[PDB]
Symmetry: C2
Amino acid sequence: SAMEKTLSIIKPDAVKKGVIGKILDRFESNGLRIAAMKKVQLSKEQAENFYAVHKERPFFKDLVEFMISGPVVVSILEGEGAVLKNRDLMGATNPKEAKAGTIRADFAESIDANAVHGSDSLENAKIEIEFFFKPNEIC
Amino acid sequence: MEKTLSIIKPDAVKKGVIGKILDRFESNGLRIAAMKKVQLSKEQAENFYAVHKERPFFKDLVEFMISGPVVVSILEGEGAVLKNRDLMGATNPKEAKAGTIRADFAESIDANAVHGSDSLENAKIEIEFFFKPNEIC
C-alpha cells in the first residue's frame, strides 16, 4: 500500500537547532512524501493528551515540559511501509545506540532530547494523525 | 532582523525537494517562524496575485499556483527579505547563480520553485494574507 501514512514530529530540540529541512529531506529522499505539515506550538494540555499513556511513569512531567518548551513540526509521511520506514530513518530511541546516518544519531542530544517522534504502529499512526490533522490538511 | 514570506511552489513540492529547500534557508541565517503545507483555491490565488489581474499571464499563473499544494512559510532573520531573494536566485532559472534554489530546482520562468516577498512592505502584506489570528481560545 503506497498510501500508508504515519505521523512524524520534529521535536523542539531539532526545531531550535534549525535542522527541520535536513530531517524532512531524510524522508523525501527515501520514498516518503510529506502529505501534510505544519509548525505548531503545543500547550501543556495538548502534550498531556498526546502522551496520556505515559501519565504512568515518573518521566511524564519532564517529557511534557520538553515537548512544549518550543514549537514542533508535525507531518504526515506517506509511502510504502511508511510506519516502519520512518522508524528505520529515525533510529533507536537512545541516540547513543542509533545507527550511523539515522536522524537520532545525527541530530539528537540524549534520550530525553531525541529530535523526532514517529508512530510506532499502523494503529497508533491512525490515532496520532487524527489528533493533529483534519482531512482537509492532507493535500 | 525581519520577517518575509516564502512559498515553495507546486513544481518543487511535487518533486519532493521541500526539505532541501528549507535547509537552504536554515543553513543561511533564516529561521522558519511559521509554516504550513496548503492547497490554494483558485479564489485565493486570484486574490494573492490581484495586482497582476490586468496582465495577460494572470490566468496561467493562477492555474500553476493551484496545480498542486505549496508550502507557505514565514522566514525570520537579519535582512530576511533580501537574504531570501539572494537564496532564491534570479527569476529566470537559466540566469540564476550557483547554489541558488532556482538554479538547482526550477525548470523555467513559469515553474520556478519559489516565491519570496520583494520588499518589507510586501512582506507585511503577504504574511498577513496567509497567517491571520487563528489561535482559538
